[PDB]
């Protein structure tokens, strides 16, 4: 079944690998990539390295943009996004001795008329779709609350979201009327929306917070763990997910590729334990390569065999 | 007259200002400029502001180059750069603090056809010309005699050659029988090309370094010296040039602005005091300006009142 993935405010992410950062000079490199970037596109390219049946929109403007649309288009995958005057953004990182130093531009001003424009092409391709993810920041002239009239617009067509943002933009949406299918908050992304430090073992303290209002009418939360995995929760039942350990080439952007794992999983109908294999894995192989938003399908397939999914008491189990 | 402009290696400059820059981790801000880049569209923009007649060349390629292509197309500046296949570089200038910490990509790979695409263009170009400057480094697949060539061709068609680059490039056609009309190299180049340490009494060093083979047959050599004004050599004449002190605020590209001044007053077929006070009056110019490639003409024409050209004996 047809994923769409959202990205509000994608980037030509460039990387330079430099042995040193020599400050108050120039520094000559030939190691450079340029690549689509943005946490929906990380989702995107896994969801299609899966094999997964996914299409692309958000917005993109000038060259820049026009660059990100021929390089998807150079990989076969399908796209939809919809035009804005603005040039979208670069992000820089620059790696060097064992360090991750990062520029992020504040990015194009989306105008009312765009702002618009891309609602019509979402409505049209809700139509189509099944699944809808939704990831990262708004671009700027976004309104703070404008993940809920997406949550919205699929709920009006049956579309399962799932929602992985931050800070204002996700309690909006909690705040809201309009709830998403998932959520994935991390650990520091829950502790900040309840100013609360979990500590270790932080499995029933994480039960407690979850049951809390603001979380309420969301059908699955997972919280990943990074190593450690995961703690999930669908309706009333809680799961402490256990993964084995594997030597990690680079681990940014494995948040990303759990969502895509989860999208994939529900778009095939998955139960409740495939599921979460199928976005632990991808989460794993992502954190095994070296490039960001990419994963090999046979690693997948083998962490598969190796998770561990264990389903928690109540308090009343001995009653 | 018209003046050609020659960039082979040109760029995207990405300008970040940041409070500070905080190691392995993120930097944010909104403070970012993007500009049309390399040492010779820094000439041509400043050409362009002095008023002249000048078309830029070069090679641009795919989106980055098309986006330098809508820049220069919006600032009304005539272009007829050779298309490539591979995508044109960005540099990134990080400034926080009082640094300027830099970084630059070896850039595009310019294969065989589109040299030979680039030559026929080049061709075209300089029937029209009197002028033509050439800046900057050659970019990959380009051969290290490849500036020997363009200034052979200008020479076919009796246009003059403004020369700034270094290194082999430079050597190279120094070493040739195909001269440029005027070189402008600074003293971290002329040590380069000598094997010579010029720490010590510079002007002076200066003055019996021009007078060697090296540098036969050339009409005009100017070596500027930041603040400190130049010491310049016309056939056998050499002349000092006494520029007034003045508050700068960014220096960066002013070599570029003095080849653009030069260009300019050349094109006016300007004598010697003349032509030496274009040159040092766009570059403090352009030093004056906060963005790089860029004067106030206003300020160009109250600097050639106050800057002094002396001849020096023999
Ligand atoms: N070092 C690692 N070893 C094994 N698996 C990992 C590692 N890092 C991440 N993973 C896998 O990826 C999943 C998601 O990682 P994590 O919880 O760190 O995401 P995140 O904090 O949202 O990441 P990001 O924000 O960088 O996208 C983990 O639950 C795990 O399955
Ligand atoms: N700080 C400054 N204050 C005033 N004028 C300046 C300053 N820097 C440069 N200029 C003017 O511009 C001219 C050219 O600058 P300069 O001699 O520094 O070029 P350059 O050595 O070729 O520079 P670069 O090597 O960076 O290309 C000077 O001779 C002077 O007229």
């Not at 108050?24 to 490199?29: E, H, I, Q, S």
């Not at 909690?174 to 299918?181: S, T």
């Given at each position: 079944?047809?994923?769409?993935?959202?990205?509000?405010?994608?980037?030509i992410?460039?990387?330079?690998?430099?042995?040193?950062?020599?400050?108050?000079?120039?520094n000559?490199?030939?190691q450079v990539?340029?690549?689509?970037?943005?946490?929906?596109?990380?989702?995107?390219?896994?969801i299609?390295?899966?094999?997964?049946?996914v299409?692309?929109t958000?917005?993109?403007?000038?060259?820049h943009?026009?660059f990100?649309?021929?390089?998807?288009?150079?990989?076969?995958?399908?796209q939809?996004?919809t035009?804005?005057?603005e040039?979208?953004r670069?992000?820089?990182?620059?790696?060097?001795?064992?360090?991750?130093?990062?520029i992020?531009?504040?990015?194009?001003?989306?105008?009312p008329?765009?702002?618009?424009?891309?609602?019509?092409?979402?409505?049209?391709?809700?139509?189509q779709?099944?699944?809808?993810?939704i990831?990262?920041?708004?671009?700027?002239?976004?309104?703070?609350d404008?993940?809920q009239?997406?949550?919205?617009?699929?709920?009006?067509?049956?579309?399962?979201?799932?929602?992985?943002?931050?800070?204002?933009?996700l309690?909006?949406?909690?705040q809201?009327?309009?709830?998403?299918?998932?959520?994935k908050?991390?650990?520091?992304?829950?502790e900040?929306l309840?100013?609360?430090?979990?500590?270790?073992?932080?499995?029933?303290?994480?039960?407690?917070?979850?049951?809390?209002?603001?979380?309420?009418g969301?059908?699955?939360?997972?919280?990943?763990?990074?190593?450690?995995?995961?703690?999930?929760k669908?309706?009333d039942?809680?799961?402490?997910?256990?993964?084995?350990?594997?030597?990690?080439?680079?681990?940014?952007?494995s948040?990303?590729?759990?969502?895509?794992?989860?999208?994939y999983?529900?778009?095939?109908?998955a139960?409740?334990?495939?599921?979460?294999?199928?976005?632990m894995?991808?989460?794993?192989?992502?954190?095994?390569?070296?490039?960001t938003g990419?994963?090999?399908v046979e690693?997948?397939?083998?962490?598969?065999?190796?998770?561990?999914?264990?389903?928690?008491?109540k308090?009343?189990?001995?009653?």
């Amino acid at each position: 079944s047809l994923i769409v993935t959202v990205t509000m405010n994608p980037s030509i992410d460039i990387s330079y690998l430099l042995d040193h950062l020599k400050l108050d000079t120039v520094n000559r490199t030939s190691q450079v990539t340029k690549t689509p970037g943005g946490k929906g596109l990380n989702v995107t390219r896994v969801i299609h390295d899966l094999g997964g049946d996914v299409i692309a929109t958000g917005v993109l403007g000038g060259f820049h943009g026009a660059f990100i649309a021929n390089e998807l288009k150079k990989a076969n995958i399908p796209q939809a996004f919809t035009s804005i005057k603005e040039e979208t953004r670069d992000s820089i990182a620059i790696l060097h001795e064992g360090n991750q130093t990062e520029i992020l531009e504040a990015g194009p001003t989306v105008s009312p008329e765009e702002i618009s424009n891309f609602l019509e092409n979402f409505d049209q391709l809700i139509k189509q779709a099944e699944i809808v993810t939704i990831s990262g920041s708004l671009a700027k002239g976004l309104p703070s609350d404008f993940y809920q009239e997406l949550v919205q617009k699929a709920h009006a067509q049956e579309v399962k979201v799932l929602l992985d943002t931050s800070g204002d933009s996700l309690r909006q949406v909690l705040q809201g009327p309009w709830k998403p299918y998932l959520i994935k908050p991390n650990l520091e992304e829950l502790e900040g929306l309840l100013g609360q430090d979990f500590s270790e073992n932080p499995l029933a303290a994480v039960q407690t917070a979850l049951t809390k209002p603001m979380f309420a009418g969301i059908e699955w939360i997972v919280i990943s763990l990074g190593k450690d995995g995961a703690i999930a929760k669908h309706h009333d039942q809680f799961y402490r997910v256990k993964i084995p350990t594997i030597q990690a080439k680079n681990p940014v952007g494995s948040g990303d590729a759990t969502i895509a794992g989860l999208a994939y999983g529900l778009a095939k109908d998955a139960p409740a334990a495939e599921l979460l294999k199928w976005g632990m894995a991808a989460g794993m192989a992502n954190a095994q390569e070296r490039m960001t938003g990419h994963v090999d399908v046979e690693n997948v397939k083998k962490h598969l065999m190796n998770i561990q999914v264990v389903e928690i008491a109540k308090e009343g189990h001995h009653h």
